Design an enzyme around this catalytic site. Sequence first.
Site, mmCIF file in Angstrom:
data_model
loop_
_atom_site.group_PDB
_atom_site.id
_atom_site.type_symbol
_atom_site.label_atom_id
_atom_site.label_comp_id
_atom_site.label_asym_id
_atom_site.label_seq_id
_atom_site.Cartn_x
_atom_site.Cartn_y
_atom_site.Cartn_z
ATOM 1 C CG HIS A 120 43.831 14.827 4.584
ATOM 2 N ND1 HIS A 120 42.674 14.146 4.884
ATOM 3 C CD2 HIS A 120 43.538 16.141 4.704
ATOM 4 C CE1 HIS A 120 41.721 15.012 5.176
ATOM 5 N NE2 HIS A 120 42.220 16.230 5.075
ATOM 6 C CE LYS A 129 40.156 18.518 10.956
ATOM 7 N NZ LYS A 129 40.453 17.565 9.858
ATOM 8 C CG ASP A 175 34.286 11.516 6.922
ATOM 9 O OD1 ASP A 175 33.628 12.552 6.704
ATOM 10 O OD2 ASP A 175 34.508 10.662 6.042
ATOM 11 N NE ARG A 177 23.063 24.387 3.189
ATOM 12 C CZ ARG A 177 21.926 25.046 3.023
ATOM 13 N NH1 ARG A 177 20.819 24.430 2.646
ATOM 14 N NH2 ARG A 177 21.900 26.358 3.237
ATOM 15 C CG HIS A 228 33.074 13.374 2.626
ATOM 16 N ND1 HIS A 228 34.302 13.912 2.943
ATOM 17 C CD2 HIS A 228 32.162 14.342 2.879
ATOM 18 C CE1 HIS A 228 34.141 15.151 3.369
ATOM 19 N NE2 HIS A 228 32.852 15.436 3.341
ATOM 20 C CG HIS A 255 37.011 22.537 4.439
ATOM 21 N ND1 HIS A 255 37.467 21.606 5.345
ATOM 22 C CD2 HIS A 255 37.572 22.214 3.251
ATOM 23 C CE1 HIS A 255 38.278 20.761 4.734
ATOM 24 N NE2 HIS A 255 38.359 21.108 3.463
ATOM 25 C CG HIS A 263 44.130 22.528 6.585
ATOM 26 N ND1 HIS A 263 42.983 23.114 6.100
ATOM 27 C CD2 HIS A 263 44.532 23.291 7.628
ATOM 28 C CE1 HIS A 263 42.696 24.179 6.826
ATOM 29 N NE2 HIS A 263 43.621 24.310 7.758
ATOM 30 C CG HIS A 316 37.293 15.035 9.521
ATOM 31 N ND1 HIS A 316 36.286 14.488 8.757
ATOM 32 C CD2 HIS A 316 38.038 15.787 8.678
ATOM 33 C CE1 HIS A 316 36.417 14.888 7.507
ATOM 34 N NE2 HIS A 316 37.473 15.678 7.432
ATOM 35 C CG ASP A 343 41.851 19.739 4.134
ATOM 36 O OD1 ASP A 343 41.674 18.708 4.814
ATOM 37 O OD2 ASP A 343 41.594 20.883 4.562
#
Lengths: 238, 238, 569, 569
Positions: D138, D219, D223, D338, D322, D274, D136, D221, D362
């Site tokens: 980045h 990937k 975003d 949540r 984000h 996730h 994961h 994602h 990540d």
Amino acid sequence: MKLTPKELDKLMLHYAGELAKKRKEKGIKLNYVEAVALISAHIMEEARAGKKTAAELMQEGRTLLKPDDVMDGVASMIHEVGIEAMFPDGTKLVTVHTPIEANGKLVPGELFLKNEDITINEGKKAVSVKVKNVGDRPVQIGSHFHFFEVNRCLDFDREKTFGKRLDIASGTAVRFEPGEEKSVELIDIGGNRRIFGFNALVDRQADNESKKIALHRAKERGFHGAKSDDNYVKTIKE
Amino acid sequence: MKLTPKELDKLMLHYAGELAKKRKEKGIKLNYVEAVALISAHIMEEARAGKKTAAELMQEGRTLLKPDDVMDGVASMIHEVGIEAMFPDGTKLVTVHTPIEANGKLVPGELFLKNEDITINEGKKAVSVKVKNVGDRPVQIGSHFHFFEVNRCLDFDREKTFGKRLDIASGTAVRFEPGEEKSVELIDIGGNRRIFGFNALVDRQADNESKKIALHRAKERGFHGAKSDDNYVKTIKE
Amino acid sequence: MKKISRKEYVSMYGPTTGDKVRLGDTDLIAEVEHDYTIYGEELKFGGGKTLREGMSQSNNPSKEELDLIITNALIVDYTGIYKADIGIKDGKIAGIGKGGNKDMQDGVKNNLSVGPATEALAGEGLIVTAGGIDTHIHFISPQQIPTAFASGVTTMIGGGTGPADGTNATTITPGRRNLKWMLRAAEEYSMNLGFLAKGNASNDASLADQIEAGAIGFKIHEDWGTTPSAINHALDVADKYDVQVAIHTDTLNEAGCVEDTMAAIAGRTMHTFHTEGAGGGHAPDIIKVAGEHNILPASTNPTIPFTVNTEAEHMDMLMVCHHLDKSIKEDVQFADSRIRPQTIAAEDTLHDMGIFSITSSDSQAMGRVGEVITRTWQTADKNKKEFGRLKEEKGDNDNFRIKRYLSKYTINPAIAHGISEYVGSVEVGKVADLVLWSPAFFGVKPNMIIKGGFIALSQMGDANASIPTPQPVYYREMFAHHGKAKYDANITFVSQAAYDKGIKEELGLERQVLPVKNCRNITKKDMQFNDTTAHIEVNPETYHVFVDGKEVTSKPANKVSLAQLFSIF
Amino acid sequence: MKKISRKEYVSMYGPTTGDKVRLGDTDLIAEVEHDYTIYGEELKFGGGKTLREGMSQSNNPSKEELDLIITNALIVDYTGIYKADIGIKDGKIAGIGKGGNKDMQDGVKNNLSVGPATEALAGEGLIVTAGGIDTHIHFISPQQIPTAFASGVTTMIGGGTGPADGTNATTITPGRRNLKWMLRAAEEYSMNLGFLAKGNASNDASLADQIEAGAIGFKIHEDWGTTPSAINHALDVADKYDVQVAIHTDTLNEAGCVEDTMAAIAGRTMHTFHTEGAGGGHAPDIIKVAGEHNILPASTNPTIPFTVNTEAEHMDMLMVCHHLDKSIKEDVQFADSRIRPQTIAAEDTLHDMGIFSITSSDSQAMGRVGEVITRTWQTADKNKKEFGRLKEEKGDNDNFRIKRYLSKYTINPAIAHGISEYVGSVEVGKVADLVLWSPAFFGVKPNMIIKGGFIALSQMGDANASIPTPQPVYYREMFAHHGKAKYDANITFVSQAAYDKGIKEELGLERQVLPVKNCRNITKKDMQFNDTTAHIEVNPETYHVFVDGKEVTSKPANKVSLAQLFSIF
């Protein structure tokens, strides 16, 4: 019925023998091929029957063909018939020697020799050496073996035999039985007289200087009858 | 007399059979190769004679060799002898099954099995489904066919059988005769449970979400017993 | 779940764990030690069987998808007697275990994935072994190669140049030019081939030249002169070039006895032919070398098993092999043998005890090329009948004896000649030189031969028939035997020196050319199941052989198995 | 023979069969399942030890002579926890078992032959594991790579182009040109590297162009827009090109819920980031996908193990990752989570049960790159303390739990990304990416890293010191990290399409370039020790997770192991 190439060959041989047998029954005098095929096929069938041993088959193969059942020269041409037959105890080679008595009329490829003996090793004088086999097994020496380097269980004056070989027909051999003492004739090795191989006692040109090195090596390695002086002077290369 | 390779092979086989017959006359117990060759050659000769049918030859091939005419183990080794024979109405394959009765003394390559049953698909619980063949032909289903996608002429609750296969020995099949109703046992398909091929009703991972798509597809394509809701909601990919 | 009777299960898929099968018509019983299959997921090919698109043939196969899979085969190997599926990919054994489709079956590894590019071969009820390795081949005629191939031999190491007298006597391919002749002729045959050079030379340059020309080892034969100097020089050059040395010792005791030969060997790895002597003057004392570590002993076909007719043919074979005219008094007098029934009988018992590690033929020179495997199993059966089960058997089976006698001609010669990395056993990564037997015909007549991943020889019926079974059935070359497929299927073994020098491109060979390796650092301890090193006390006064004090002997067999039940001639 | 006390034997050679060792300061006990060594023949290096010329270093070595041998290592692997010598040759694991000299020791295979060309590495008292695989990553800064390397991670699969905002949010290297940038920059680092492309595109041509440019997968994602259309197109292209697809699902439920995302996936293999939701709108229902066969679920570092401070940092991490400004009312209102302590606690229990198959970081986007292994073992220890020994333990040890949690970051990500043929475990034939731990520091600080058969990183003392031990000791690059040695040591993973097109020569890469394979035909069932597929009933009204009916929960840990005992900061 998975058949191997050997089985196919044997089937062909068997039916060649059957053809020869039919011709013999018709009364045709068999030729070379027919005679060989007949003997081989008969041996194979007897072995398959399995009531006879290989020795019995070797004896029986010589009684199949009379001298009058074959053409002239067939008996001379056929010296021995070998055949691999499958017995109850596996495959064995049955050899029949001189299966047909020679009539003597016609001998194909016969030799007409002169009545004069061949003198071998002409111009070479032979010396006599007494050799005793003090080992437990017989020893065979070939005509061209360097006699100085023979089995160390043979006992003789090696100094006399340095550079020499047996004075016999080339390709023949002399046998020394254990305990037995024989007298042999030795002649000088010809050509360049370079001894290489054998027991690696010389491995160089055979002359009087290499004789001392060879004798010292033989005494060190325990060759019987090799006498070297106790006070031996080494050379730069030996 | 233009001879084909097949004819040459058959001639070799015929003369192997002749050799076997001669050995049998001599009283030698035939081995495996001789027995097979004898039966095949006899069938070929009878077919060439042309007075018998292939059925008659199949019957007659079983009477050629008595159990006492062959070595021990030959009858066990010979299961069936096939031979392509040229009849007056062309070449036909004559098959003789168990041509020699087994003596039971020696069985080459015999199995000594344990007296314990093999439990297949252990740890998999089987559900029972009633299947009716409403078609006009019998249907055979293999052990590993995805039972949900079987012939659409079979009628059963396909929803119960999604993701399942027959719980039988792998490589065996279950036959449903027309009109006949049977009860079968089904077990979950193992591994990744990715169903691809068959009737292309799933073509993806077998889960509850793909179950609805498969049921709708089966109902659309007319698979019997596939019940899908009238108000079916399509997905982005289906 | 469901339970099916073991008889039905075995009929469908072959024997499973704990099941016993008789090997041929012998008295040897092999028990399946373990099974890789998962019950109820067996691979079957047929009309409505499991090997179908989407069931066992994957529709999304792994990238290691097999080229060929043998299903439900009973692998008989020195590594064990077990049941599995053999996967073959790119001419090697890709995997052994449970094959099939990962999408619909559990426990399927990536290297055993069956896909659309996979051919299926039903091995159910069939024994799979590695191809035989015959290391004493006198290359007298090329017709020996198909005979050995049909017998189940896939690798032939030997020497010769055709029916010359040097080849009739010795296993020797002498010289660079003759090696080139034989290597270029080897392209024709469907058999892995290796050639031995002449070791009978005191010239290091000549020996090295032969090795660089392509021989995988040296042969020191009495007929070219087995002298201590030659033995020493050949062993020196072979230690330099990492190649095996085989020896057929001096029969006449011209230069020395067994002690002198062993002194010349000087504790270096040596592969001995006729370690029983075969009537030579070193007999019976040469049997003593079978207890040394550095000696890999081999025994030839004709003297095993010891039978009623064994002794009758020996003199004829000896004279013809050694090229002594039977019409010459001098040659007949020279042809003196020290063979004894005591030694011939002791040979079988030494094989049973594992003192002798390799069985071979010496084809058409006192030995039968197509009978190595058959005579090995005849010896095993005879010893089982005589001495009963070995003490090493861990069960009510003959698995240990099976493995010992199978190693005698599969893995032990491979180790001896340094090709055990490629051939000799059914292991992952080895070349796919497999033999399929039916258990009724085991040891005498194979069902088929897989050479380099493709079927090369097979029992086949009439070509015009509507099925492959009908008569006449005999051994026919398959597609791997023909065209340019045989170049991909077959291997020529050369020395590492020749391989580095580029013998393949230099001679224009199209076969795979592989170098032999690890020939010098092996002893008797490296033989599988045949590593028994025991002080062999040989009394030559009585011709009595003792190992660990106990005398060894066997009685002649009046009737052997696998002999007349299976062969018309 | 002689008997020595077990305490003395273990001090000399490390634990043997039946001996137990605690892993780090945790409560996990690993038991040595079996030992390949022969007692009295152990390999030791030192003054008068056995690894000497003629004793254990062969003077006539096999041709497969090892380049490096690790002696008496306790191999901890998903294949088993055992004791052996590891042989490394040509950058691969050549053999595992008893190494040494065949001339003077018994039971030494040819592939474990120690010779004059062999370097020795004392693994006695040391655990050897495969290098970590972090999937994961980045790629925000290159300084992450040495941090993960020092933590024990040897393979990094991820995406990014530096600290761009797209990279800060997503694990994506978008486009052929950016992929070329990253592949050429990868030549600098001592770490196996793989790059993921942008899957958020409804253009098959663009997706295929990225794969051919060299990405090992896609990937998708949130975003960049996680829409069902993009999911469908990416999965189609990935099934065409045999590459993995990873997904970070839509947090906002803009286009649909978890059911719509799963419908777009349509039962195709997908690797989920996730899977607990990480506070997304799909939570907690997205945990339901962890029971599907086609979903390979991964969980990130920050939420494991569940502690007292776990929930405090989540909103800050989420906002920064984000890219929502904390000074903007609209962005703050948008940043709705949540997340629940019930879900965070259930994550650890799902890991213990094997519902979650992969652990990852990540890195620097809600996750710590140098803490994957440490947090995996913290979760394992916490679960051991809470629920006790697993029911699958066949003995008085935690071997099953050790293997499950070790698979979580060694073999499971390798299988998921199609590199399990090369890395992920200590097996023969795999690349020698090994980590040497001392058992006191297991899971937190390795002793050394072997990269491609050579030591690449090691704890080292003062360079001016007279021995390597004295302070300051920290992790320093070794010779495999420098010069052109790193090109031979490291691997860049690419797609098979790029490999066939010759990406290595086209981009002038000097690293080994290897294709990924078998990414599409894997399911949850292919994960090792983490293949539990259970219907996960998630009640979103109560945020309650049930597996097979029983509710799953855990209590927050007040103090974890491997945290403050080992780190100054």
